[PDB]
Symmetry: D2
């Protein structure tokens, strides 16, 4: 498996993602990032049922939560309804309990925006810091 298969993703900007200024409403970018992260994990081969609560086939609710503790974005060029965006993800293990993902959005080969999302692994019930789930660790390693 070539990592581009799960780190190079694509999406098309839809009409409801825009505001009356005629361009993407800013916070939608973060939704797109989160969804591309989920898509990446899926494409690498992880099962949603093992990572995300609310999943149909979980035998138990996943034990480790991955709350976002920081995120940011820079908006460089306007993004429009119907734009085909090329998304490149670059994950980084920060320590045994945390990781971040950088997201770069290109349209017609030019960078239109980029974002960074940082997660901490905690026990979902105690909220104490804990080790990253094994599947997330495999994905981080494979994506090096």
């Amino acid at each position: 498996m070539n990592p581009e298969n799960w780190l190079l993703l694509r999406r098309v900007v839809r009409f409801g993602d825009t505001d009356a200024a005629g361009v993407m409403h800013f916070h939608q970018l973060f939704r797109w990032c989160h969804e591309s992260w989920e898509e990446s994990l899926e494409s690498y081969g992880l099962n949603p049922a093992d990572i995300f609560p609310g999943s149909r086939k979980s035998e138990v609710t996943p034990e480790v939560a991955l709350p976002i503790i920081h995120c940011q974005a820079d908006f460089r060029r306007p993004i429009h309804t119907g734009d085909a965006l090329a998304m490149e993800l670059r994950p980084e293990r920060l320590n045994p309990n945390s990781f971040q993902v950088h997201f770069e959005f290109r349209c017609e080969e030019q960078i239109a925006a980029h974002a960074l999302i940082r997660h901490l692994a905690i026990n979902a019930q105690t909220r104490h810091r804990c080790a990253l789930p094994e599947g997330i660790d495999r994905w981080l390693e494979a994506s090096g």
Copy 2:
């Protein structure tokens, strides 16, 4: 307590609620309905912790889920950023296990949209139909 206190509500249309057509994006109406229903329950005097999962002060997760089984809306006049909307709610008990709420949205005294949301009471763990929670029944009765 006069029921208008919890059935007549107000909100202002915000920029992110609009699309590049220069008017409210259609599905936002439903979010506004749901939020006004929550506001109504709050204004009548019910505690979120007794009705909605995810609440900070629940001693246990609420036992009865109120899934939406049907909803609809008619859009009659365009709705714009910065519009002050007067919302009137009209709840109806349908049977011991179900209710619906009608929402009318006025701007400058004219009806711009209206919607209807129907809920069924089910046990959150078994998903069997069950009786409406007592607080919801009090609200329905008070709102007659």
Copy 3:
């Protein structure tokens, strides 16, 4: 071109689409419908720039608006994060100035929800009723 290519679509339910009840938050369904309608038009071969305002490559803003005048949905089975949903679209010309689209959502071959969205064609500047744009008429005809 076989119409299934643009009327049979797929999407995966993402974590942000769910609420603390552990299932899809109801109004997201409508967003999914609208986005699948846009996807259908794209897949049939229409150019966003000719239909939707806010598009990058429009020579002029499209002259005909397609406001939603009515929509509704029935929710039959719970929908969960990571569910693969098979979406089937069935468009219907209603008259020379209007159409609706029916959306059926299946998961593991069973209908989980369905929705209906009705549009009116109006001149974007005058807001008078007008004929459907030619591309939308081609799509309706091809989808018969």
Copy 4:
């Protein structure tokens, strides 16, 4: 007029703002920030019609766009459905063409999250940098 009237704002976390982890879904924070900024401008006394496109009563579409070029947030404590959040806004003029707003969210007197949004003033048609609109400059000055 005391600036707290437009810089100290309040909102209640609603059920649709949460995900299946049982807490606010991260990107909603940014929507809340943007809406509180709009609320602040309104509360200071500015007219939406002069600042935001899509407004009902604009004689012409506002000439100056205020695109967000950067934003970020830190999430410190979990935020739950029904939480009453105290929002404090701290605007800063950066130069004649730009400003940022810092947003602090408190619940039960403790900081749960904070965010920063930076805007650039551009001519809406040319997209060249330009001076801040006079009303935004009045608000910035009053909020010092």
